[PDB]
């Protein structure tokens, strides 16, 4: 999932840069379709990315609590 | 079984006139020259129901005259029993059917068939 998101990010950056550069040289629906497809992938997993971090902080708190309980029990 | 049911099956599944002739032979082992069974009467009844005749059953009757299935006498009697006369299209169809065999009008059979042709004329 992290790998998929990173791959989508790299593809988006390179293809957007190429399309903009071709526009600049002149004065690309294939690139456009690729952009919207990986944009959907990143956006749908960006709501996830934010919540994941909040969940991770909660998990860290839970872990600390469990550790204390065990050490106390021991 | 009846001639009306055979003609009506011939209308239901679209049969061309020669396939109608073959299947009409197959439905009835005794031919009885087809005039004992009154082919011309049944074909005219179920052709002249609408304001205009259905061209299928008229095609059947024109084949049954041009091929010598049906004698001219039975056709001329069945034409004679139509009247109604309010519809010009059925009357024009009957006059084209009469235009087929008239001036020819040649019975080749018994003399009673020739007398029948006389009364039919």
């Amino acid at each position: 999932t992290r790998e998929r998101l990173l791959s989508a990010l790299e593809d988006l950056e390179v293809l957007s840069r190429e399309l903009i550069e071709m526009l600049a040289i002149s004065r690309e629906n294939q690139v456009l379709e690729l952009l919207i497809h990986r944009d959907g992938e990143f956006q749908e997993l960006m709501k996830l990315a934010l919540n994941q971090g909040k969940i991770h902080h909660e998990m860290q708190v839970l872990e600390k609590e469990v550790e204390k309980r065990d050490s106390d029990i021991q | 079984v009846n001639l009306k049911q055979a003609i009506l099956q011939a209308w239901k599944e679209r049969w061309s006139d020669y396939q109608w002739a073959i299947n009409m032979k197959k439905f009835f082992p005794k031919g009885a020259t087809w005039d004992i069974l009154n082919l011309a009467d049944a074909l005219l009844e179920q052709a002249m129901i609408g304001p205009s005749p259905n061209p299928l059953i008229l095609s059947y009757l024109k084949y049954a005259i041009s091929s010598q299935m049906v004698s001219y006498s039975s056709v001329l009697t069945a034409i004679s029993k139509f009247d109604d006369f309010s519809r010009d299209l059925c009357v024009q169809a009957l006059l084209d059917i009469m235009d087929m065999f008239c001036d020819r009008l040649s019975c080749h059979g018994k003399a009673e068939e020739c007398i029948g042709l006389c009364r039919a004329l």
Binding site: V14, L15, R17, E18, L19, E21, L23, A24, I25, S26, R27, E28, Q30, V31, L32, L34, I36 | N2, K4, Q5, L8, W11, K12, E13, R14, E45, Q46, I49, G50, P51, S52, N54, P55, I57, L89
Partner: protein, 469 residues
């Protein structure tokens, strides 16, 4: 494949930068219309806050090849010819259309784009300049006269919307709003009034029926059209039109464009011409059997990849019984020529005086098409032993057809000849042999058809009524 080649090119660029590419572009500049069009495409996919939504409105302008001038952030105007409108020639800004305002306030920039397209098409008018302004004035006079004629019918009879659409002078008329031009609803079929028993109310949908649009369009020939409202004096019953000349010989005529071309028969062309006189098809094009065209219109209402390959033997499945209908095109009419007709999309009328007569003929031709149209279906009825009652439709004469079926109880063929005398009125006679079982009462069949809809349906009622007796 193309994407793989592009990735390989990106790998080559990595081996070789974006900064270098920018420098190369700058060198080329130191050393266009497609790039402008491309800007609109990537600015259409851009979607952000109000500032960028104003740049999305600028994108909409260049997308339709329009010119945008903005005074302050609040007001931006797209201007071409007389098609100038502002989201905050020869006329005041007509209205703050709720339709346009609602779409913009909500997130529907696409709907606003469609509305501009409609406005551009209405003013695709060739003409020149002062002529265009006069030509638009003529359309305004026609619209005012048609609106008044509709009002007269409502004053004379307080008819419900359904009555106005089916049997009224002009038709239910919606005045032009933005791009959309006036729509007169010629006919609302009984089957389609019912959806999955709709009551129209004054909320009648724009597309819930058959609709025709009134518009001005340029023609090669030159014609005289009213440039001012011609119903200055109206006789209380029906209408009276003051005679021409005011008027001018603009090289165009009023039109009654139909969104989907309506198949029309040769006889109708003569009956319609008798009134107007303007050649309906002018340059004589093609003219084949009408029943084939009726099938194409009905089959193409819903599009599917596989052609039906009907062979004019459409199969219909109904709640009780199964029916197969052969449309019998090529049956000779009394003249000896099969019913032949050509799709008509545009009908041109100078004044609205001949319009009541032209519409009455069209309503009759549309009604006949709908009753025969109801049968056309995409049925794969293969190897059907039970039922498969088989009926054949023959063209007896223009405006008449005969559905022939075996007698439900007895054995002789029985034929119902239906003539579409008027758009909403069909007269049918059952032909039955001298010795036969009374199949049906013509009134009971009529009651069932009017309460429900279509003609594949009429044959069911004839069979059921006979069986019940």
């Amino acid at each position: 494949l193309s994407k793989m080649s592009s990735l390989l090119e990106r790998l080559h660029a990595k081996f070789n930068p974006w900064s270098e590419t920018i420098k190369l572009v700058r060198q080329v500049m130191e050393k266009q219309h497609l790039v402008s069009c491309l800007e609109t495409l990537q600015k259409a996919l851009k979607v952000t806050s109000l500032p960028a939504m104003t740049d999305r409105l600028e994108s909409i302008a260049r997308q339709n090849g329009l010119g945008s001038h903005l005074s302050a952030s609040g007001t931006e105007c797209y201007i071409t010819s007389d098609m100038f409108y502002v989201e905050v020639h020869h006329g005041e800004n007509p209205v703050s259309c709720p339709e346009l305002v609602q779409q913009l306030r909500e997130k529907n920039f696409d709907e606003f784009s469609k509305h501009l397209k409609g406005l551009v098409n209405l003013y695709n008018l060739p003409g020149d300049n002062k002529l265009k302004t006069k030509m638009y004035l003529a359309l305004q006079s026609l619209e005012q006269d048609l609106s008044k004629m509709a009002i007269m019918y409502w004053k004379a009879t307080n008819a419900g919307p359904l009555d106005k659409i089916l049997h009224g002078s002009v038709g239910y008329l919606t005045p032009r709003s933005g791009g959309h031009l006036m729509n007169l609803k010629y006919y609302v079929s009984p089957s389609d009034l019912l959806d999955d028993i709709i009551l129209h109310e004054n909320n009648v949908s724009r597309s819930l029926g058959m609709n025709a649009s009134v518009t001005i369009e340029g023609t090669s020939a030159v014609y005289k059209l009213p440039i001012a409202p011609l119903i200055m004096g109206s006789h209380p019953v029906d209408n009276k039109w003051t005679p021409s000349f005011n008027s001018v010989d603009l090289p165009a005529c009023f039109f009654l464009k139909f969104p989907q071309p309506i198949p029309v028969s040769r006889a109708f062309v003569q009956k319609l011409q008798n009134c107007t006189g303007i050649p309906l098809f002018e340059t004589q094009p093609t003219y084949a059997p009408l029943y084939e065209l009726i099938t194409q219109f009905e089959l193409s209402k819903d599009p599917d990849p596989i052609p039906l390959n009907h062979n004019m033997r459409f199969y219909a499945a109904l709640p009780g019984q199964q029916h197969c209908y052969f449309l019998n095109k090529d049956a000779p009419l009394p003249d000896g020529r099969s019913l032949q007709g050509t799709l008509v999309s545009k009908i041109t009328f100078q004044h609205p005086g001949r319009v009541p007569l032209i519409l009455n003929l069209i309503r009759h031709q549309v009604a006949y098409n709908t009753l025969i149209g109801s049968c056309v279906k995409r049925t794969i009825l293969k190897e059907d032993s039970p039922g498969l009652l088989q009926f054949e439709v023959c063209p007896l004469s223009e405006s008449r057809f005969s559905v022939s079926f075996q007698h439900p109880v007895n054995d002789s063929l029985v034929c119902v000849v239906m003539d579409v005398q008027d758009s909403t009125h069909v007269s049918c006679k059952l032909y039955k042999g001298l010795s036969d079982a009374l199949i049906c009462t013509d009134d009971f069949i009529a009651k069932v058809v009017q309460r429900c809809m279509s003609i594949p349906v009429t044959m069911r009622a004839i069979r059921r009524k006979a069986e019940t007796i």
